[PDB]
Amino acid sequence: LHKEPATLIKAIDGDTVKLMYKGQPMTFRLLLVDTPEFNEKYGPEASAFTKKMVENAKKIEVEFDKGQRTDKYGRGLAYAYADGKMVNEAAVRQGLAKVAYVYKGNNTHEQLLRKAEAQAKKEKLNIWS
Ligand SMILES: Cc1cn([C@H]2C[C@H](OP(=O)(O)O)[C@@H](COP(=O)(O)O)O2)c(=O)[nH]c1=O
Ligand SMILES: [Ca+2]
């Protein structure tokens, strides 16, 4: 896979963010994860975690997987990086996202993220407390 440039337009919630990619505004949905909705338990904490990570980054990048690059709602589907650190992984590692929505052929980082979930669960963090 390849990292590509993007810039933050606006944080949205734990697993979606609005970015400018190739000069166009897009909502991105993070691959392979599910955060609680803002209205649910840990939702506000997941939103705040992803907001801080993307707002504090000097450099945002997106990395598309091998399959679909957009979903049925027109959201980009990607791995997002903040100063080199994967947001999708970091939210799972802190127990603020579950591994989810693992579709065949857009699942390059599945094992990396399942290892992060196992660690968060062993630590009883957040969702796993
Ligand atoms: C993450 C992901 C979500 N989606 C779709 C499945 C779900 O459809 P439904 O809306 O019909 O439930 C929705 C979940 O996104 P949210 O968790 O952002 O609600 O997005 C994909 O199609 N591909 C993906 O990789
Ligand atoms: Ca969600």
Side-chain angles (χ1 to χ4, degrees), residues 2 4 8 24 45 52 71 89 93 100 107 109 125:
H2 294 283
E4 297 179 62
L8 179 67
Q24 302 305 325
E45 291 78 11
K52 180 168 190 222
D71 69 17
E89 186 193 18
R93 179 64 182 87
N107 73 334
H109 299 310
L125 237 51

Side-chain angles (χ1 to χ4, degrees), residues 23-84:
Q24 302 305 325
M26 285 173 64
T27 294
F28 282 83
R29 175 64 166 82
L30 294 184
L31 282 170
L32 305 185
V33 306
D34 191 37
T35 49
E37 303 295 325
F38 182 80
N39 76 296
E40 305 173 325
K41 188 161 192 180
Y42 299 106
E45 291 78 11
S47 294
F49 174 91
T50 295
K51 176 186 167 65
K52 180 168 190 222
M53 193 165 178
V54 297
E55 284 183 354
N56 293 7
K58 298 309 198 333
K59 170 165 91 178
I60 300 291
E61 297 167 288
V62 295
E63 178 182 58
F64 294 100
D65 208 318
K66 298 302 278 172
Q68 302 269 43
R69 294 186 176 198
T70 67
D71 69 17
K72 65 183 177 191
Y73 303 118
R75 304 181 297 178
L77 295 172
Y79 312 100
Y81 294 85
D83 290 332

